[PDB]
UniProtKB/Swiss-Prot annotation:
It comes from Homo sapiens (Human). NADP(+) binds at residues 18-19, 45, 159-160, 183, 209-215, 262-264, 268-272. The keyword Isomerase does not apply. The active site is at Y50. This is Aldo-keto reductase family 1 member C3. Pfam families: Aldo_ket_red. Pathway: Steroid metabolism.
Length: 298
């Protein structure tokens, strides 16, 4: 159950989100990643930022070693943090994530964000106050292309890019590889349909994060509506006899969007893979489309 990427690699269309806030002890990511792979998840999303690549890699290696999966059947994503946008740091940042996970390659490496930060996770000046750096994203992308040339990243992509930022790269002279994907916040309240049409037009897969309405970490307005209590999602839930989460994920699959889903809960993890068992009608799809309201959680 995969989509073919513009470099000829395959990405599974449902993936497991691995971020948990720092209140969650690290070991938890080991345990939940194992459960995710047991339930049928094969695409696993992590990042230097999440401080979990050691535990996530252990869960992957544990399931490889006991024969539960082959390495070739796992799609593991990691991402380049913004203090490493300088080109000479890009391959060493990837190599560090590889050391931590003890994996030989990542299936996908992404530029985590278009923003550049002072090299050194969040460098802060004398009053606050994040220290930005000016780095041409196109020169970061070229160092990204070398990681794919080297086989350290099977596929390379971007995250949190808008259409102009995508075009900075697509319009680059001497361009060797398109990004395979643009991983962005995308759910029924902020559906990105304009960005989606753009990405489809360039054969770039859109990958939705916060598809279930985010973890609402209080560091996210607590007044924002709660996506999974949306009366449309719940009316669809009862009509199809699934849940609001599953309606939200299935909407993404039928629009050609690859969809992530974080859960640190055993039943919810198993539940999320039911997304392949049912479909939404065109009229369902249309009701969900009607929910777009430009609500940004993150
Ligand atoms: N590239 C980026 O900048 C970026 C940004 C944000 C996220 N991401 C990636 O995307 C992943 C997912 O996004 P996210 O962390 O915002 O969360 P999300 O997938 O929108 O999940 C939100 C919450 O949904 C709950 N949930 C999951 N399945 C459910 C179900 N069947 N019924 C009810 N509730 C359910 C989970 O809580 P429980 O844990 O309690 O089940 C989870 O906290 C992240 O983990 C990370 O891998 C990337
Ligand atoms: C400046 C900047 C840009 C993109 C970013 N993305 C994330 C991220 O990936 N998070 C935080 C929220 C939910 C799960 C994981 C943090 C972050 C910070």
């Amino acid at each position: 159950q995969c989509v073919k990427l513009n470099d000829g690699h395959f990405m599974p269309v449902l993936g497991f989100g691995t971020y948990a806030p720092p209140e969650v002890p690290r070991s938890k990511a080991l345990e939940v990643t194992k459960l995710a792979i047991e339930a049928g998840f094969r695409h696993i999303d992590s990042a230097h930022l999440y401080n979990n690549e050691e535990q996530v890699g252990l869960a992957i290696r544990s399931k490889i070693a006991d024969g539960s999966v082959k390495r070739e059947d796992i799609f593991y994503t990691s991402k380049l943090w913004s203090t490493f946008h300088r080109p000479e740091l890009v391959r060493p940042a990837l190599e560090n994530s590889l050391k931590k996970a003890q994996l030989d390659y990542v299936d996908l490496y992404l530029i985590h964000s278009p923003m550049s930060l002072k090299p050194g996770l969040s460098p802060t000046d004398e009053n606050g106050k994040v220290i930005f750096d000016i780095v041409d994203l196109c020169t970061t992308w070229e160092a990204m292309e070398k990681c794919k040339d080297a086989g350290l990243a099977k596929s390379i992509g971007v995250s949190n890019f808008n259409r102009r930022q995508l075009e900075m790269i697509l319009n680059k002279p001497g361009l060797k590889y398109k990004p395979v994907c643009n991983q962005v916040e995308c759910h029924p309240y902020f559906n990105r349909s304009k960005l989606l049409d753009f990405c489809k037009s360039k054969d770039i897969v859109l990958v939705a994060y916060s598809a279930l309405g985010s973890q609402r970490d209080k560091r996210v307005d607590p007044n924002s509506p709660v996506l999974l209590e949306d009366p449309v999602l719940c009316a669809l839930a009862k009509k199809h006899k699934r849940t609001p989460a599953l309606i939200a994920l299935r909407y993404q699959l039928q629009r050609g969007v690859v969809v992530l889903a974080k859960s640190y809960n055993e039943q919810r993890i198993r539940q999320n893979v039911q997304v392949f068992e049912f479909q939404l009608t065109a009229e369902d799809m249309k009701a969900i489309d009607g929910l777009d309201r430009n609500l940004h959680y993150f």
